[PDB]
Scaffold this active site. Structure first.
Site, PDB file in Angstrom:
ATOM      1  N   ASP A 128     -25.025 -46.606  60.581  1.00 51.55           N
ATOM      2  CA  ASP A 128     -23.520 -46.634  61.140  1.00 51.55           C
ATOM      3  C   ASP A 128     -23.178 -45.337  61.820  1.00 51.55           C
ATOM      4  OD1 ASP A 128     -21.170 -47.278  61.443  1.00 51.55           O
ATOM      5  OD2 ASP A 128     -20.387 -47.346  59.358  1.00 51.55           O
ATOM      6  N   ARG A 132     -16.934 -41.136  63.631  1.00 53.28           N
ATOM      7  CA  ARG A 132     -16.331 -41.218  62.315  1.00 53.28           C
ATOM      8  C   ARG A 132     -17.241 -40.857  61.105  1.00 53.28           C
ATOM      9  NH1 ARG A 132     -16.805 -46.160  63.707  1.00 53.28           N
ATOM     10  NH2 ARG A 132     -18.447 -47.198  62.742  1.00 53.28           N
ATOM     11  N   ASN A 133     -18.389 -40.747  61.499  1.00 47.42           N
ATOM     12  CA  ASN A 133     -19.540 -40.599  60.392  1.00 47.42           C
ATOM     13  C   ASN A 133     -20.374 -39.260  60.908  1.00 47.42           C
ATOM     14  OD1 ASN A 133     -18.981 -42.792  58.723  1.00 47.42           O
ATOM     15  ND2 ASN A 133     -19.979 -44.082  59.900  1.00 47.42           N
ATOM     16  N   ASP A 146     -23.682 -39.314  55.989  1.00 43.82           N
ATOM     17  CA  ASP A 146     -23.680 -40.419  55.443  1.00 43.82           C
ATOM     18  C   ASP A 146     -24.615 -41.573  56.110  1.00 43.82           C
ATOM     19  OD1 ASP A 146     -21.826 -39.717  53.569  1.00 43.82           O
ATOM     20  OD2 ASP A 146     -20.029 -40.065  54.878  1.00 43.82           O
TER      21      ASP A 146
HETATM   22  C1  LIG Z   1     -10.877 -34.041  56.047  1.00 48.71           C
HETATM   23  N1  LIG Z   1     -11.548 -33.266  55.821  1.00 48.71           N
HETATM   24  C2  LIG Z   1     -13.032 -33.547  55.235  1.00 48.71           C
HETATM   25  C3  LIG Z   1     -13.620 -32.204  55.319  1.00 48.71           C
HETATM   26  N2  LIG Z   1     -14.875 -32.017  54.900  1.00 48.71           N
HETATM   27  C4  LIG Z   1     -16.005 -32.935  54.455  1.00 48.71           C
HETATM   28  N3  LIG Z   1     -17.231 -32.316  54.197  1.00 48.71           N
HETATM   29  C5  LIG Z   1     -18.197 -33.130  53.569  1.00 48.71           C
HETATM   30  C6  LIG Z   1     -18.019 -34.598  53.590  1.00 48.71           C
HETATM   31  C7  LIG Z   1     -16.644 -35.095  53.933  1.00 48.71           C
HETATM   32  C8  LIG Z   1     -16.662 -36.590  53.921  1.00 48.71           C
HETATM   33  C9  LIG Z   1     -17.532 -37.363  54.123  1.00 48.71           C
HETATM   34  C10 LIG Z   1     -17.228 -38.856  54.026  1.00 48.71           C
HETATM   35  C11 LIG Z   1     -15.679 -39.151  54.024  1.00 48.71           C
HETATM   36  C12 LIG Z   1     -14.849 -38.198  54.022  1.00 48.71           C
HETATM   37  C13 LIG Z   1     -15.019 -36.886  53.737  1.00 48.71           C
HETATM   38  C14 LIG Z   1     -13.418 -38.745  53.491  1.00 48.71           C
HETATM   39  N4  LIG Z   1     -12.952 -39.197  54.906  1.00 48.71           N
HETATM   40  C15 LIG Z   1     -11.310 -39.134  54.874  1.00 48.71           C
HETATM   41  C16 LIG Z   1     -10.714 -39.227  56.155  1.00 48.71           C
HETATM   42  O1  LIG Z   1     -11.024 -37.907  56.661  1.00 48.71           O
HETATM   43  C17 LIG Z   1     -10.929 -37.388  55.337  1.00 48.71           C
HETATM   44  C18 LIG Z   1     -12.970 -40.581  54.807  1.00 48.71           C
HETATM   45  C19 LIG Z   1     -14.506 -40.987  55.137  1.00 48.71           C
HETATM   46  C20 LIG Z   1     -15.450 -40.627  54.204  1.00 48.71           C
HETATM   47  N5  LIG Z   1     -16.560 -41.681  54.080  1.00 48.71           N
HETATM   48  C21 LIG Z   1     -17.418 -41.967  53.271  1.00 48.71           C
HETATM   49  O2  LIG Z   1     -17.289 -41.426  52.089  1.00 48.71           O
HETATM   50  C22 LIG Z   1     -18.572 -42.920  53.787  1.00 48.71           C
HETATM   51  C23 LIG Z   1     -18.587 -43.778  54.673  1.00 48.71           C
HETATM   52  N6  LIG Z   1     -19.668 -44.333  54.576  1.00 48.71           N
HETATM   53  C24 LIG Z   1     -20.211 -45.315  55.323  1.00 48.71           C
HETATM   54  C25 LIG Z   1     -21.516 -44.665  56.134  1.00 48.71           C
HETATM   55  C26 LIG Z   1     -19.207 -45.848  56.180  1.00 48.71           C
HETATM   56  C27 LIG Z   1     -21.110 -46.515  54.476  1.00 48.71           C
HETATM   57  N7  LIG Z   1     -20.279 -43.732  53.430  1.00 48.71           N
HETATM   58  N8  LIG Z   1     -19.902 -42.765  52.991  1.00 48.71           N
HETATM   59  N9  LIG Z   1     -15.744 -34.090  54.572  1.00 48.71           N
HETATM   60  C28 LIG Z   1     -12.747 -31.368  55.722  1.00 48.71           C
HETATM   61  N10 LIG Z   1     -11.510 -32.160  55.915  1.00 48.71           N
END
Ligand SMILES: Cn1cc(Nc2nccc(-c3ccc4c(c3)CN(C3COC3)CC[C@H]4NC(=O)c3cn(C(C)(C)C)nn3)n2)cn1
Length: 265
Positions: A128, A132-133, A146
């Site tokens: 994926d 966005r990832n 991810d």
């Molecule tokens: C705003 N923000 C964020 C930081 N730092 C930071 N550092 C390290 C990790 C993260 C982080 C990683 C992942 C996600 C988020 C945060 C939340 N994120 C919200 C929108 O944006 C904040 C949404 C996406 C979420 N996705 C998943 O969990 C996910 C998706 N998949 C698939 C591949 C689709 C199966 N698998 N896991 N964020 C600073 N500011």
């Protein structure tokens, strides 16, 4: 070895909600920044992910968001990863205040390509790949996040190639037609990512629905050159979209091509 004691975590700020529920920023042992995925009940194939986490622990590259460990003795389980202060690449690109130089945009592509060359060398698919990832740290370095986790998503709207959450706009024709995933579908997605970077985060095929996008890709329609991409940069992203998967490059070749354009520029 893969297990982190959740008592060592201090929770400090909610970052947002993704496919598995809430993600938070916190500290480990009072000192070290981490991100903490709190895995929502019903969202993940937990036993299979826990077994795979052992393999993911050993993936280590400067441009890959590092997995630190899991907390599995309780429910919800936690996934502890490297923290990236500037959040997801997509939203970063859409912040016009940055007024990016095209050399910065090329360096974002190189960051991602180095991570993907590493995953390719381990025969590990992202599955994926998209802006966005990817995430951005406090130094503006982009890292791939991810990777592999799509395999543990239970939501049929994400898994089905015709579901509302499936990454249609990052998928090659053989994925849309036959669900044939390979190294070369990660290649296709990477080209779309390069397009996202040079388009400052526009949605690919933005005038079309997912259904229309699948139809047009199958008929040979392609994304076209972003305003900020040079001809040489556009040649690299376009090479990722050959109809025949075996004509697409490897990440090693893509990295060499990107480094060449850096020298030109
Ligand atoms: C705003 N923000 C964020 C930081 N730092 C930071 N550092 C390290 C990790 C993260 C982080 C990683 C992942 C996600 C988020 C945060 C939340 N994120 C919200 C929108 O944006 C904040 C949404 C996406 C979420 N996705 C998943 O969990 C996910 C998706 N998949 C698939 C591949 C689709 C199966 N698998 N896991 N964020 C600073 N500011």
């Amino acid at each position: 070895s893969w297990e982190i004691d959740p008592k060592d975590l201090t929770f400090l700020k909610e970052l947002g909600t993704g496919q598995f529920g809430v993600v938070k920023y916190g500290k480990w042992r009072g000192q070290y920044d981490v991100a903490i995925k709190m895995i929502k009940e019903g969202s993940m194939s937990e036993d299979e992910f826990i077994e795979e986490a052992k393999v993911m622990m050993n993936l280590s590259h400067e441009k890959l968001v590092q997995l630190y460990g899991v907390c599995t003795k309780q429910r919800p389980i936690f996934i502890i990863t490297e923290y990236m202060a500037n959040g997801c690449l997509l939203n970063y690109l859409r912040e016009m205040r940055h007024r990016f130089q095209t050399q910065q945009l090329l360096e974002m592509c190189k960051d991602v390509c180095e991570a993907m060359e590493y995953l390719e060398s381990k025969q590990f698919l992202h599955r994926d790949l998209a802006a966005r990832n990817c995430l951005v740290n406090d130094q503006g370095v982009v890292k791939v996040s991810d990777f592999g986790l799509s395999r543990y998503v239970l939501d049929d709207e994400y898994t089905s190639s015709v579901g509302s959450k499936f990454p249609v706009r990052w998928s090659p024709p053989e994925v849309l037609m036959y669900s044939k995933f390979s190294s070369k579908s990660d290649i296709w997605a990477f080209g779309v990512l390069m397009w996202e970077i040079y388009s400052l985060g526009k949605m690919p095929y933005e005038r079309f629905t997912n259904s229309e996008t699948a139809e047009h890709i199958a008929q040979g329609l392609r994304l076209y050159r972003p305003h900020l991409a040079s001809e040489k940069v556009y040649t690299i992203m376009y090479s990722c979209w050959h109809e025949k998967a075996d004509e697409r490059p490897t990440f090693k070749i893509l990295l060499s091509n990107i480094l060449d354009v850096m020298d030109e520029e």
